[PDB]
């Protein structure tokens, strides 16, 4: 390719917008950020690597509270992802101001995907480099999980594995029953997954982040308590060997 990859306003001979492949190539170099949905809520298992340990425990946070009932887990550049979080917050606030009830999830996904895809046509902008996932739960409807790529696609899943280890991790979610077990007995599976997938020689150390939503939190998206994170880590460390 001579110059067919210098702009987002150019189709290559076979038909391809190379600048988007080149962007998504960025998320293939970040840490794994899987998340699932069984029967009553969503659960994310983001993992943040340890670098320059002089930092505090809780820097480079990769789990935002987009709204009172939805949660986000990102993967890739943090700045663009923060911008998109602000975008989603504004969208969900305007929706409520105009209509008068909590926004659903399908509409949020579609709107944010339109915003993301607006940048895949012109040459005056740069395609995003983040691929995130949204999770929510309600009483009228049920549990809803989604995912977005830098191109603007929105599909509904039962389990996702955004990150560099996109493969070899989805398999570890197949054997599990991601529709029957309740939202309390899956933290262990997610933890042991992200633990056994991790490489111990190419990387020094890491820290584990979590989240929760469902009937236990009454639809509110909150961090996972530490008293159960202790037993989760114990389960993982005992199961690895």
């Amino acid at each position: 390719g001579t110059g067919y990859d210098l702009s987002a306003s150019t189709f290559s001979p076979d038909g391809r917008v190379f600048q988007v492949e080149y962007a998504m190539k960025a998320v293939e170099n970040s840490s794994t950020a899987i998340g699932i949905r069984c029967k009553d809520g969503v659960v994310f298992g983001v993992e943040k690597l340890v670098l320059s340990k002089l930092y505090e425990e809780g820097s480079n946070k990769r789990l935002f509270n987009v709204d009172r009932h939805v949660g986000m887990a990102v993967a890739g550049l943090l700045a663009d992802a923060r911008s998109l979080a602000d975008i989603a917050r504004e969208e969900a606030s305007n929706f409520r101001s105009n209509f008068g009830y909590n926004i659903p999830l399908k509409h949020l996904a579609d709107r944010v995907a339109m915003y993301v895809h607006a940048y895949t046509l012109y040459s005056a902008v740069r395609p995003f480099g983040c691929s995130f996932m949204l999770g929510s739960y309600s009483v009228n409807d049920g549990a809803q999980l989604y995912m977005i790529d830098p191109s603007g696609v929105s599909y509904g899943y039962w389990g996702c594995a955004i990150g560099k280890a996109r493969q070899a991790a989805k398999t570890e979610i197949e054997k599990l029953q991601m529709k029957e077990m309740t939202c309390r007995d899956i933290v262990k599976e997610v933890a042991k997954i992200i633990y056994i997938v991790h490489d111990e020689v190419k990387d020094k150390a890491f820290e584990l982040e979590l989240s929760w939503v469902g009937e236990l939190t009454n639809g509110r998206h909150e961090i996972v308590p530490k008293d159960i994170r202790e037993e989760a880590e114990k389960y993982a460390k005992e199961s690895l060997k």
Binding site: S151, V153, Y157, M178
Partner: protein
Amino acid sequence: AGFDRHITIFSPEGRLYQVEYAFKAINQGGLTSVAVRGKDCAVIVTQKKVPDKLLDSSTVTHLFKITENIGCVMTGMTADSRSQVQRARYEAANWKYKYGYEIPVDMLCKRIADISQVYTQNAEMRPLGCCMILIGIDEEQGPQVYKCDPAGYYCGFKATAAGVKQTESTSFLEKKVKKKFDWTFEQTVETAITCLSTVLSIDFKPSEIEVGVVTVENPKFRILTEAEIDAHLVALA
């Protein structure tokens, strides 16, 4: 030349290489589709490829409800298909609000193509890669099929196919209209399904196909849940 392949401008021969390149972007998804018209019914059939058992089946669908009495199906570069669909929806509603009555099909396809044309004139943008098929029912001409393009050229059809296997499917459908016959409800679906069964050699399953119909007795867009697809697939069994 020089910048003739990077933007919408003319070569020494008058061609727009960008649109020609975009035409090939429909074959990336690896999908297909067909659409036929009969005596009092219009029908559409599309494929459904879901390789991962972990993916929610009831969220992937190229069929959309532009508006009651009208329906569409898309092909290629899914990311832009939803944009085109949203545009169609907004246009239809604005028309119903401005002029008091519903918008027909030909009008909507013409408007969408009018919009998809300036992208072949301005340079700060590129043409979208997708093919839109539409079906509707008008009280004057009866059923109506239509199809836009990435270049802005539309035209009326009786039957057609789109996606990867386009020419190999047209060469087969051309052999059936040569014998004009009566197609009410059961003679369109069978033909549309045999087209795919013969071009792909699949022996289809009642979840590997998506079907959308509209007939005179009930001019509302439907989806033909598995309960009826099974019956219509065993009918010709």
